[PDB]
């Protein structure tokens, strides 16, 4: 009974992983397409003379901020779903290890588990990388927009100070969010490594 | 003593589940009612000339946004409540399986649990469906409102670009929220399936 | 060793519970005092003519909303704190029961736990009651304020519609918040009741 | 084999603790530097006459609020990170205690565990202390800014009432947020102490 039920369970877990990959794909494509439309709309307003330079700079900052917030939200979701897939794979691993008790099978299942564990760590390293590049890049652009207005006299001192303060607040918030994503992820990876050690020692 | 105590706990849980179904019903009716009242207020402002076309379109977008956010909040609560009930059913299942150890009772309890598990998965598929359809329809309405204002000249180009951008931001945020709800629900279902498999194999 | 070490832990837990009762009391008082100050500030603005009728009605609504949100927040913390103390007592109880294994001691300890569990359920029922009454009363006042402005012509039709919409939104959000708090509390209590049953059956 | 594997696992845990310490350090430096820039911008606006007295008071309040929120969030993250590390250390401790069962080794390891628990309790006491002092200071500064605007006639009665209400709200929210955080930390400290007891009783 267990071997077929485990096979069915394993196939469903793989289907779920495919669903997760599809959602991550849609998020990234949707993020990019919506961003493209926002950049094009701002470009049209600038070319049309539909907004003042200060208004355009603020809209560009709002765009960039929203872009990052969406990216961060997705990153938390993606890391959570992926780390959950790794934990779920460990539960699947244990169900199979407790059924097919052949040591040779257990070592191959454990080897596959280690490869997935490494891959997830690599995924988080990629996420941390893109976060840092995106925040650094968007921040430079935000500061450059404020400078452009200041150089041109497109905004009052209070308006410029507020843009600077609003930016710094968003920057700081992005850092808190990334901090939580990374921190939660590294703790989960260590827990998974400890679980992996016990399974290897037990087989 | 244990059997009557288990009966009382079992009956209590059934009552809790029934209460939650009633609450979810009331929420949905209340959201529909309040949404309708808003639709009527906007309709009268439009017919009466109490607001400009741009003001009315913005209010319609605010209405749709709030509607969806309430629906998403309830969906998180509903999926959490329903999956929690399923977990509570498994907890009750184990209390009885480890008391009344008759395999035939265990089989009745396990078959009922398996059916409940399938039904919850179907519930989440329905919720995900409704979310996607609702966001698509609301998105279509939002774009049409903007198109109307732009063709009529009811709003400046900067105002229209902002509505388009604000819409896209809200659209993406709604998608992210739904994805988080769906993912957590699927993970919980996988964990429950793993628990169900162990219980069936162990009895 | 454990009897004295547990004595110290038991004393600690009692001290923590007393501290939490005091803190919750202080927060209740702060909300009451802060609420008083706010109501008085609005009353004086009305008597002084420091704000228009529509603005005064809006401030009254903002006040009521903030009050309820604070009440809900405090309730969420209080129920989680009380439930955590209830869980901590079961954890402390298991440590004591497996040290002092005298059945007669276990019977007294189990009876005390059961009475506290019932008391906590009564506390949540009281909170749920208060929430429902409070939202209903605040809602009635909100509806009356909007109607007063409508009868007097204190606000444009679009402005009145916006107040009605903001009102309905806040109303529903409060209903959703209370639903989530109450349901989680009920779920936690049932899990504790199921755990209490196994512990009593084993002693 | 187990001893070398345990050594590698311990080395990784040390690395993880270093990763979290570095991120928290950098975040706190960022918080401080951005706050300093904000303060300098406000100082220039005041000296330049770029904003009214009421506008400057509001900006100072917004600054203080944002700081407190970021600081409190960072503290929450830090306390959670430390507890997570302590839990990982306890798991690591059991991996070692279940391999090297020599009571003499266990006592030295248990002595370190007790020291780490005391150290986190001291960390939380410092955080709770700083939060309270900071809340008092910032609240004091806020009240004084409002008082001066009222005496100077820099704001209308309705504007001042709103500032007082916003002040009271921010105060209570910060206090409630800190309450939840601190209470959770205290609960975690007790749970860790309960684990410390069982670890000692078993060796």
């Amino acid at each position: 009974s267990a071997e077929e039920l485990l096979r069915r369970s394993r196939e469903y877990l793989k289907k779920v992983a495919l669903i997760q990959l599809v959602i991550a794909f849609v998020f990234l494509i949707l993020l990019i397409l919506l961003s493209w439309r926002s950049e094009e709309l701002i470009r049209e307003l600038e070319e049309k003379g539909a907004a003042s330079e200060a208004e355009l700079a603020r809209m560009k900052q709002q765009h960039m901020t929203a872009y990052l917030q969406a990216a961060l939200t997705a990153w938390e979701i993606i890391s959570k779903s992926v780390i959950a897939l790794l934990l779920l794979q460990q539960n699947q691993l244990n169900l199979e290890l407790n059924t097919d008790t052949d040591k040779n099978v257990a070592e191959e299942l454990l080897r596959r588990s280690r490869e997935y564990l490494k891959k997830v760590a690599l995924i988080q390293l990629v996420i941390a990388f893109v976060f840092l590049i995106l925040l650094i890049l968007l921040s430079w652009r935000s500061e450059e927009l404020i400078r452009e207005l200041e150089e041109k006299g497109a905004a009052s001192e209070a308006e410029l100070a507020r843009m600077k303060q609003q930016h710094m607040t968003a920057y700081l918030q992005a850092a808190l969010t990334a901090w939580e994503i990374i921190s939660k992820s590294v703790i989960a990876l260590l827990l998974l490594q400890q679980n992996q050690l016990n399974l290897e020692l037990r087989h």
Side-chain angles (χ1 to χ4, degrees), chain A residues 27 31 62-75 134 138 170 173-174 177:
Chain A
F27 169 73
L31 178 66
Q62 290 169 347
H63 170 194
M64 290 189 287
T65 299
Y67 183 90
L68 181 59
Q69 290 170 345
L72 286 166
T73 298
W75 287 331
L134 183 60
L138 294 175
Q173 290 171 345
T177 300

mmCIF file of all heavy atoms in Angstrom, chain A residues 27 31 62-75 134 138 170 173-174 177:
data_model
loop_
_atom_site.group_PDB
_atom_site.id
_atom_site.type_symbol
_atom_site.label_atom_id
_atom_site.label_comp_id
_atom_site.label_asym_id
_atom_site.label_seq_id
_atom_site.Cartn_x
_atom_site.Cartn_y
_atom_site.Cartn_z
ATOM 1 N N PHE A 27 4.598 36.313 -11.710
ATOM 2 C CA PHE A 27 4.943 37.515 -11.004
ATOM 3 C C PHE A 27 6.006 38.289 -11.721
ATOM 4 O O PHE A 27 5.865 39.493 -11.892
ATOM 5 C CB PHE A 27 5.468 37.263 -9.601
ATOM 6 C CG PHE A 27 6.053 38.541 -9.057
ATOM 7 C CD1 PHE A 27 5.256 39.594 -8.674
ATOM 8 C CD2 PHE A 27 7.425 38.694 -8.962
ATOM 9 C CE1 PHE A 27 5.796 40.761 -8.217
ATOM 10 C CE2 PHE A 27 7.963 39.863 -8.506
ATOM 11 C CZ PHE A 27 7.132 40.900 -8.133
ATOM 12 N N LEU A 31 5.412 41.848 -13.293
ATOM 13 C CA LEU A 31 6.144 42.947 -12.684
ATOM 14 C C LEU A 31 6.795 43.772 -13.782
ATOM 15 O O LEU A 31 6.681 45.003 -13.801
ATOM 16 C CB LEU A 31 7.263 42.389 -11.770
ATOM 17 C CG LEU A 31 8.212 43.413 -11.057
ATOM 18 C CD1 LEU A 31 7.443 44.262 -10.023
ATOM 19 C CD2 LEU A 31 9.400 42.683 -10.428
ATOM 20 N N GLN A 62 7.557 57.140 -7.027
ATOM 21 C CA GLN A 62 6.451 56.294 -6.600
ATOM 22 C C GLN A 62 6.479 54.986 -7.363
ATOM 23 O O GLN A 62 6.244 53.922 -6.788
ATOM 24 C CB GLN A 62 5.133 57.020 -6.832
ATOM 25 C CG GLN A 62 4.905 58.205 -5.906
ATOM 26 C CD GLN A 62 3.731 59.049 -6.343
ATOM 27 O OE1 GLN A 62 3.238 58.893 -7.466
ATOM 28 N NE2 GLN A 62 3.279 59.940 -5.473
ATOM 29 N N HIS A 63 6.811 55.070 -8.648
ATOM 30 C CA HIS A 63 6.939 53.923 -9.523
ATOM 31 C C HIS A 63 8.025 53.001 -9.026
ATOM 32 O O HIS A 63 7.792 51.806 -8.825
ATOM 33 C CB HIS A 63 7.270 54.429 -10.935
ATOM 34 C CG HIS A 63 7.676 53.426 -11.975
ATOM 35 N ND1 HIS A 63 8.252 53.829 -13.157
ATOM 36 C CD2 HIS A 63 7.635 52.065 -12.031
ATOM 37 C CE1 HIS A 63 8.552 52.780 -13.885
ATOM 38 N NE2 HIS A 63 8.195 51.698 -13.231
ATOM 39 N N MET A 64 9.202 53.555 -8.778
ATOM 40 C CA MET A 64 10.315 52.751 -8.337
ATOM 41 C C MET A 64 10.058 52.129 -6.981
ATOM 42 O O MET A 64 10.408 50.968 -6.743
ATOM 43 C CB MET A 64 11.553 53.618 -8.297
ATOM 44 C CG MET A 64 12.057 54.016 -9.685
ATOM 45 S SD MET A 64 13.666 54.832 -9.661
ATOM 46 C CE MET A 64 13.282 56.449 -9.002
ATOM 47 N N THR A 65 9.412 52.875 -6.098
ATOM 48 C CA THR A 65 9.136 52.367 -4.781
ATOM 49 C C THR A 65 8.168 51.218 -4.867
ATOM 50 O O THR A 65 8.392 50.181 -4.245
ATOM 51 C CB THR A 65 8.559 53.460 -3.866
ATOM 52 O OG1 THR A 65 9.512 54.520 -3.731
ATOM 53 C CG2 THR A 65 8.264 52.874 -2.486
ATOM 54 N N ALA A 66 7.099 51.379 -5.644
ATOM 55 C CA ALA A 66 6.107 50.334 -5.771
ATOM 56 C C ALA A 66 6.711 49.093 -6.392
ATOM 57 O O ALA A 66 6.367 47.975 -5.996
ATOM 58 C CB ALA A 66 4.950 50.822 -6.608
ATOM 59 N N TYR A 67 7.618 49.288 -7.354
ATOM 60 C CA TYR A 67 8.277 48.199 -8.040
ATOM 61 C C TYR A 67 9.031 47.361 -7.030
ATOM 62 O O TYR A 67 8.875 46.136 -6.977
ATOM 63 C CB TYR A 67 9.255 48.746 -9.080
ATOM 64 C CG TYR A 67 9.944 47.703 -9.892
ATOM 65 C CD1 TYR A 67 9.363 47.278 -11.060
ATOM 66 C CD2 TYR A 67 11.134 47.159 -9.478
ATOM 67 C CE1 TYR A 67 9.982 46.318 -11.828
ATOM 68 C CE2 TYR A 67 11.744 46.185 -10.245
ATOM 69 C CZ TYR A 67 11.174 45.772 -11.413
ATOM 70 O OH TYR A 67 11.790 44.807 -12.178
ATOM 71 N N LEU A 68 9.814 48.031 -6.185
ATOM 72 C CA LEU A 68 10.581 47.335 -5.179
ATOM 73 C C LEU A 68 9.691 46.680 -4.157
ATOM 74 O O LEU A 68 10.001 45.582 -3.707
ATOM 75 C CB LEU A 68 11.558 48.261 -4.473
ATOM 76 C CG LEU A 68 12.460 47.608 -3.363
ATOM 77 C CD1 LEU A 68 13.310 46.465 -3.907
ATOM 78 C CD2 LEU A 68 13.362 48.639 -2.826
ATOM 79 N N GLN A 69 8.608 47.336 -3.752
ATOM 80 C CA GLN A 69 7.751 46.726 -2.758
ATOM 81 C C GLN A 69 7.170 45.442 -3.301
ATOM 82 O O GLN A 69 7.107 44.435 -2.587
ATOM 83 C CB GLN A 69 6.606 47.662 -2.403
ATOM 84 C CG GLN A 69 6.996 48.880 -1.617
ATOM 85 C CD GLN A 69 5.846 49.847 -1.519
ATOM 86 O OE1 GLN A 69 4.870 49.728 -2.270
ATOM 87 N NE2 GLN A 69 5.933 50.797 -0.597
ATOM 88 N N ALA A 70 6.769 45.450 -4.572
ATOM 89 C CA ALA A 70 6.230 44.255 -5.169
ATOM 90 C C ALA A 70 7.285 43.183 -5.259
ATOM 91 O O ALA A 70 7.008 42.017 -4.985
ATOM 92 C CB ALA A 70 5.701 44.559 -6.541
ATOM 93 N N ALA A 71 8.511 43.574 -5.610
ATOM 94 C CA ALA A 71 9.586 42.618 -5.730
ATOM 95 C C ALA A 71 9.888 41.990 -4.387
ATOM 96 O O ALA A 71 10.035 40.778 -4.301
ATOM 97 C CB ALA A 71 10.803 43.298 -6.305
ATOM 98 N N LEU A 72 9.876 42.790 -3.319
ATOM 99 C CA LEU A 72 10.120 42.292 -1.978
ATOM 100 C C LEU A 72 9.033 41.380 -1.506
ATOM 101 O O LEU A 72 9.317 40.355 -0.886
ATOM 102 C CB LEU A 72 10.248 43.450 -0.998
ATOM 103 C CG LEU A 72 11.530 44.275 -1.040
ATOM 104 C CD1 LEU A 72 11.327 45.558 -0.268
ATOM 105 C CD2 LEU A 72 12.654 43.479 -0.343
ATOM 106 N N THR A 73 7.791 41.723 -1.811
ATOM 107 C CA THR A 73 6.685 40.896 -1.399
ATOM 108 C C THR A 73 6.806 39.567 -2.090
ATOM 109 O O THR A 73 6.660 38.513 -1.466
ATOM 110 C CB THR A 73 5.349 41.552 -1.756
ATOM 111 O OG1 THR A 73 5.228 42.800 -1.066
ATOM 112 C CG2 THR A 73 4.184 40.637 -1.366
ATOM 113 N N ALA A 74 7.090 39.597 -3.389
ATOM 114 C CA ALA A 74 7.233 38.368 -4.107
ATOM 115 C C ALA A 74 8.395 37.584 -3.596
ATOM 116 O O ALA A 74 8.279 36.390 -3.426
ATOM 117 C CB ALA A 74 7.443 38.625 -5.550
ATOM 118 N N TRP A 75 9.497 38.239 -3.269
ATOM 119 C CA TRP A 75 10.654 37.525 -2.794
ATOM 120 C C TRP A 75 10.341 36.816 -1.503
ATOM 121 O O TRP A 75 10.736 35.665 -1.344
ATOM 122 C CB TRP A 75 11.837 38.476 -2.671
ATOM 123 C CG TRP A 75 12.414 38.881 -4.042
ATOM 124 C CD1 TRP A 75 12.393 38.140 -5.198
ATOM 125 C CD2 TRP A 75 13.060 40.135 -4.402
ATOM 126 N NE1 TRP A 75 12.983 38.836 -6.215
ATOM 127 C CE2 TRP A 75 13.390 40.053 -5.752
ATOM 128 C CE3 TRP A 75 13.370 41.294 -3.705
ATOM 129 C CZ2 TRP A 75 14.021 41.088 -6.413
ATOM 130 C CZ3 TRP A 75 13.991 42.326 -4.375
ATOM 131 C CH2 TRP A 75 14.316 42.222 -5.689
ATOM 132 N N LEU A 134 18.813 45.968 -7.013
ATOM 133 C CA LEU A 134 17.644 46.755 -7.271
ATOM 134 C C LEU A 134 17.525 47.924 -6.309
ATOM 135 O O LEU A 134 17.199 49.026 -6.733
ATOM 136 C CB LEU A 134 16.398 45.863 -7.188
ATOM 137 C CG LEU A 134 15.043 46.526 -7.499
ATOM 138 C CD1 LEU A 134 15.045 47.081 -8.936
ATOM 139 C CD2 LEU A 134 13.926 45.492 -7.311
ATOM 140 N N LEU A 138 17.776 51.708 -7.732
ATOM 141 C CA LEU A 138 16.628 52.574 -7.642
ATOM 142 C C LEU A 138 16.962 53.756 -6.758
ATOM 143 O O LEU A 138 16.501 54.867 -7.019
ATOM 144 C CB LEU A 138 15.427 51.825 -7.069
ATOM 145 C CG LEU A 138 14.833 50.655 -7.928
ATOM 146 C CD1 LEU A 138 13.745 49.998 -7.099
ATOM 147 C CD2 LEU A 138 14.317 51.115 -9.258
ATOM 148 N N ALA A 170 11.684 54.954 2.737
ATOM 149 C CA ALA A 170 11.414 53.780 1.930
ATOM 150 C C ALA A 170 12.630 52.866 1.839
ATOM 151 O O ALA A 170 12.489 51.643 1.857
ATOM 152 C CB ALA A 170 10.989 54.204 0.543
ATOM 153 N N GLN A 173 12.957 50.978 5.036
ATOM 154 C CA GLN A 173 11.933 49.951 5.118
ATOM 155 C C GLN A 173 12.280 48.770 4.236
ATOM 156 O O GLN A 173 12.040 47.614 4.610
ATOM 157 C CB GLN A 173 10.591 50.524 4.699
ATOM 158 C CG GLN A 173 10.006 51.514 5.672
ATOM 159 C CD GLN A 173 8.807 52.203 5.091
ATOM 160 O OE1 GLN A 173 8.591 52.131 3.877
ATOM 161 N NE2 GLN A 173 8.015 52.857 5.932
ATOM 162 N N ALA A 174 12.837 49.046 3.055
ATOM 163 C CA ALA A 174 13.231 47.983 2.162
ATOM 164 C C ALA A 174 14.307 47.149 2.814
ATOM 165 O O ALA A 174 14.292 45.920 2.716
ATOM 166 C CB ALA A 174 13.733 48.557 0.860
ATOM 167 N N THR A 177 12.784 44.840 5.376
ATOM 168 C CA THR A 177 12.104 43.725 4.760
ATOM 169 C C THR A 177 13.097 42.695 4.263
ATOM 170 O O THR A 177 12.909 41.494 4.467
ATOM 171 C CB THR A 177 11.221 44.199 3.602
ATOM 172 O OG1 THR A 177 10.240 45.116 4.099
ATOM 173 C CG2 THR A 177 10.501 43.002 2.982
#
